[PDB]
Design an enzyme around this catalytic site. Structure first.
Site, PDB file in Angstrom:
ATOM      1  N   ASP A   1     -17.744   2.500  10.260  1.00  0.00           N
ATOM      2  CA  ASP A   1     -18.589   2.076   9.286  1.00  0.00           C
ATOM      3  C   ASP A   1     -18.214   0.518   9.384  1.00  0.00           C
ATOM      4  O   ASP A   1     -17.402   0.165   8.465  1.00  0.00           O
ATOM      5  CB  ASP A   1     -17.821   2.457   7.480  1.00  0.00           C
ATOM      6  CG  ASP A   1     -19.012   4.123   7.036  1.00  0.00           C
ATOM      7  OD1 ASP A   1     -19.694   4.073   7.036  1.00  0.00           O
ATOM      8  OD2 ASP A   1     -17.931   5.044   7.984  1.00  0.00           O
TER       9      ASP A   1
ATOM     10  N   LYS B   1       1.102  -0.909   0.146  1.00  0.00           N
ATOM     11  CA  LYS B   1      -0.083   0.297   0.265  1.00  0.00           C
ATOM     12  C   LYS B   1       0.893   1.494   0.061  1.00  0.00           C
ATOM     13  O   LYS B   1       1.985   1.437   1.044  1.00  0.00           O
ATOM     14  CB  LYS B   1      -0.520  -0.271   1.360  1.00  0.00           C
ATOM     15  CG  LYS B   1      -2.177   1.007   1.251  1.00  0.00           C
ATOM     16  CD  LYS B   1      -2.878   0.774   2.240  1.00  0.00           C
ATOM     17  CE  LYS B   1      -4.097   2.424   2.573  1.00  0.00           C
ATOM     18  NZ  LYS B   1      -4.452   2.047   3.684  1.00  0.00           N
TER      19      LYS B   1
END
Lengths: 114, 141, 122, 107, 69, 190
Positions: free
Chosen positions: F115, F35
């Site tokens: 979330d 990443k």
RNA sequence: UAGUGGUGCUAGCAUGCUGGUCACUGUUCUGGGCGCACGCGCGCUACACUGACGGAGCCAGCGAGUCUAACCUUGGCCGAGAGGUCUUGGUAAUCUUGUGAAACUCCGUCGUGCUGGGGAUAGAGCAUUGUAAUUAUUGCUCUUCAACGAGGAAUUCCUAGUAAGCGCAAGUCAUCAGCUUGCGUUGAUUACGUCCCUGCCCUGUAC
């Protein structure tokens, strides 16, 4: 036995092309009605000679005519069909009637995202 | 006096179509109940027994109000929107074979006639007939 | 009297639905084909399926599998001008996906592109 | 709307236009908040009280008539009747209460 | 569960005695408080209205409005 | 902006797969998985690496962090598939039950997800893959966000799976409720 | 080359009303290619009752067209449809064309059930353009009936005949758009402020 739309195999081969077109679906009927070109005639000329001289199979004749309709006169012949690159060798079995020759020679490889 | 212009449109149609079915002279093509009436439609007319007479009455009224019409214009009028599946809707004309026979059938009984300048025009007997139904329609109220 | 569930052509149909729509449970019986069959049988289209008696489910079953005798216009049928024998047929029940799931296998046997592409995708 | 007033003329008996006015005036919030983060309580002008009334009413009807068995007019008529009463069953009244009690806490 | 779609004799009796109890009736009103499908309610209203048990005040295809009177 | 290339040099030297492209993104790009964050402030990456390292130092079902420098992070590649296309798991009652108990652990560690929903759960049989905009248990809206997560997971099991000591049917209590490590990484709310 | 009314002829109704038919306002040939584990973005169609389907009502504006030969096509006839065939007007305010468009309005069927929502994928047959439609241009008919329950983090456009809904015409063009531009129909809610965010433009000391 094999039969085509109710016509038996033994009455085929005897049937002419201009008879055979009456059985075929719309695409074939239009193609002949619109007047097929001369180009098959030279192919047909050669194909007959190879069959007549044959000792048993007639061995391949090769052509670029992918857009040509399979018709009973050519049943049993062995043909090499061009592929844009190579030739593929095929024998005209009776089930092939009314197909295009191009359906038997694959212009592209599979792809597998290896 | 009374004219067809003096009566509500759908009210007049329902009255006249019912009457015309009783006369029985209006002759059906017989392929009725198969045809969709338009290539844009799905399912055939739902009022399976009566729908042909009701269309016949509509045509007569529409010609009565106008100078003349032909088959092409009727196909436009009764057209509609075709869904085209996932694509956007579009206008499509209705069946011709229906409407041409309607004109011929109405002509057999003398309501309508072929006209100079093409197409069909109302007969004087057509006028005489349709006015009488109009008067009944008002008085029947 | 009323029957909540019935069985025909080895398919189950519930009585609680308009007869025209109820029949479309059968593979091959589309809405238009169902609608026109009922008309020729002259059943009441507005009856619910559970209202009908045995002699009324018969005739219907008969017309479905012999449609050409009732002068249905042939172009209504799903198997026009069959490849082996030039007769016209309508295909019903389990016989659907027995002609399908066969014509592709016939194409495989002839090494046609379309057959190969299908089985290669599998 | 035409069908809605008729229904209200039978469920209850008053001149229905009066019932509409009652619902509007009883619904419009009189206190609110703004963000500063945190919220600070503020007063709301009479015009906006009217706008909030109309918005809450139609939304409360619309979301009841989705996937419905009752038509729009059947649901909208009920909101108006429930809001002319002090009836907390109505969506619009439930929404009013929270705005004001929230504002009370932040003032 | 599913609403009834054919009129049992017991519900027919139930319909005629109970309907005059209601100030307002409509297709939805019947389908909600009586376990009948909407395809019955459209027929039942035409029947009861011609029978004179309920008074029409407006009719509009998509909506119809009948009252105790 | 040649640093967008030259920044490799520390990782390129300290790190051995070449990796492959997986997807462009708005805040970061992803490529045995690497990443890359997105001129200066992104060296954010340290905050992420230490946060993930702490949670993986605990027993939580999260990917193991390996290494991090110069806005570059390397992590365990996930074997599963995204939950949002799940339709037929063989033991949905235990799966429901134990997703609930996962929330309890975060709350006991003083943390709440923003979330916790099917866009960031991958298939106990599952792993939780990121923690955007996490908040402390002490935040003024902690219970409001807490109950959103519970109802979000309940809605999914109703709509697709038709499902509706442990939680749910077969346990004493149907689902947890808010009233029943933040100071180390004060993301918000002390 | 436009409209209204009168005048002459004339049909129906009733004892005036609605219609048809003078005045005013290098060269070249044959075949192939321009496939999809996946990531990013502009779109099309839906998840239904403020709906789907059937019948009936009935209203625009901006374009574009052939003798170079063959464009836009009225009317009659044939056929379930797609489509075919015999004649005709227009080099155009004159003919196609009132481009009788869609949404919409009214009267019925359906009844909250992946259902009559939705129509991908796939099988059979009939036509049309072209020198040639197989890996398939388009159109018509029957059959098969998938995901999808209003969609996380993020994010786009916009202050009045405007947004949004709906459709048409031109462009490219043998055929072929879910594209681009223009036009008309129906027609809202919410501000009439600020420098909070983002970005731009003016006038030395902890950086």
């Amino acid at each position: 036995t094999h039969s085509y739309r109710g016509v038996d195999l033994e009455k085929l081969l005897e049937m002419s092309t201009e008879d055979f077109v009456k059985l075929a679906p719309a695409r074939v009927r239009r193609r002949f009605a619109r007047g097929m070109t001369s180009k098959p005639a030279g192919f047909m000329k050669k194909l007959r000679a190879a069959k007549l001289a044959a000792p048993e199979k007639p061995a391949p004749v090769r052509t670029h005519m992918r857009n040509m309709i399979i018709v009973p006169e050519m049943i049993g012949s062995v043909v090499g069909i061009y592929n844009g690159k190579a030739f593929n060798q095929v024998e005209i079995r009776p089930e092939m009637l009314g197909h295009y020759l191009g359906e038997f020679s694959i212009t592209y490889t599979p792809v597998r995202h290896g | 006096g009374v004219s067809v212009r003096d009566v509500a449109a759908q009210d007049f149609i329902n009255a006249y179509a019912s009457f015309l079915q009783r006369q029985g002279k209006l002759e059906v093509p017989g392929y009725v109940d198969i045809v969709k009436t338009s290539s844009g439609n799905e399912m055939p007319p739902q009022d399976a027994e009566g729908w042909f007479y009701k269309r016949a009455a509509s045509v007569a009224r529409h010609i009565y109000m106008r100078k003349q019409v032909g088959v092409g214009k009727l196909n436009k009028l009764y057209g509609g929107a075709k869904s085209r599946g996932v694509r956007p809707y579009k206008h499509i004309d209705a069946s011709g074979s229906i409407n041409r026979k309607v004109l011929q059938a109405l002509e057999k009984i003398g309501i309508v006639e072929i006209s100079p300048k093409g197409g069909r025009r109302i007969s004087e007997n057509g006028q005489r007939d349709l006015d009488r139904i109009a008067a009944q329609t008002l008085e029947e109220d | 009297s009323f029957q909540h569930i019935l069985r025909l052509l080895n398919t189950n149909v519930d009585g609680n639905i308009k007869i025209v729509y109820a029949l479309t449970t059968i593979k091959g019986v589309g809405r238009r084909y169902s609608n026109l069959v009922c008309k020729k049988a002259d059943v009441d289209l507005h009856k619910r399926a559970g209202e009908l008696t045995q002699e009324e489910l018969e005739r219907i079953v008969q017309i479905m599998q012999n449609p050409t005798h009732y002068k249905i216009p042939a172009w209504f049928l799903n198997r026009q001008n069959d490849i082996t024998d030039g007769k016209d047929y309508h295909t019903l029940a389990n016989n659907v996906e027995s002609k399908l799931r066969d014509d592709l296998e016939r194409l495989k046997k002839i090494r046609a592109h379309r057959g190969i592409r299908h089985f290669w995708g599998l | 709307i035409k069908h809605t007033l008729d229904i209200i003329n039978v469920l209850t008996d008053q001149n229905p236009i009066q019932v509409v006015v009652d619902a509007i005036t009883n619904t419009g919030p009189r206190e609110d908040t703004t963000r500063v983060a945190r919220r600070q309580a503020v007063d709301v002008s009479p015009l906006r009280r009217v706008n909030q009334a109309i918005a809450l009413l139609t939304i409360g009807a619309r979301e009841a008539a989705f996937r419905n068995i009752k038509t729009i007019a059947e649901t909208l008529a009920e909101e108006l009747i429930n809001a002319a009463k002090g009836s907390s069953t109505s969506y619009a009244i439930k929404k009013k209460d929270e705005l004001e009690r929230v504002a009370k806490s932040n003032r | 569960a599913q609403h009834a779609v054919i009129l049992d004799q017991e519900k027919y009796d139930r319909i005629l005695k109970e309907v005059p109890t209601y100030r307002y009736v409509s297709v939805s009103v019947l389908v909600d408080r009586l376990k009948i499908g909407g395809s019955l309610a459209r027929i039942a209203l035409r029947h009861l209205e011609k029978e004179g048990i309920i008074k029409p005040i407006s009719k509009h295809s998509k909506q119809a409005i009948y009252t105790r009177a | 902006n040649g640093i967008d290339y030259l920044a490799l040099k520390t990782m390129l030297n300290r790190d051995y797969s070449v990796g492959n492209t997986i997807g462009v993104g708005k805040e970061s790009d992803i490529y045995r998985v690497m990443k890359i964050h997105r001129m200066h402030l992104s060296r954010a990456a340290n905050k992420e690496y230490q946060f993930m390292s702490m949670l993986y130092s605990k027993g939580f079902k999260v990917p193991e962090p390996f290494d991090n420098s110069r806005h570059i992070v390397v992590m365990e590649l996930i074997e599963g598939y995204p939950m949002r296309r799940l339709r037929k798991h063989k033991n949905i009652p235990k799966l429901y039950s134990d997703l609930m108990c996962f929330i309890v652990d975060l709350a006991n560690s003083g943390l709440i997800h923003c979330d916790f929903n099917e866009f960031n759960i991958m298939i106990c049989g599952f792993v939780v893959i990121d923690f955007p905009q996490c908040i402390s248990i002490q935040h003024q809206d902690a219970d409001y966000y807490f109950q959103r997560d519970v109802d979000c997971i309940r809605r999914f099991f109703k709509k697709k799976l038709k499902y509706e000591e442990g939680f749910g049917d077969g346990y004493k209590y149907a689902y947890p409720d808010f009233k029943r490590l933040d100071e180390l990484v004060q993301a918000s709310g002390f």
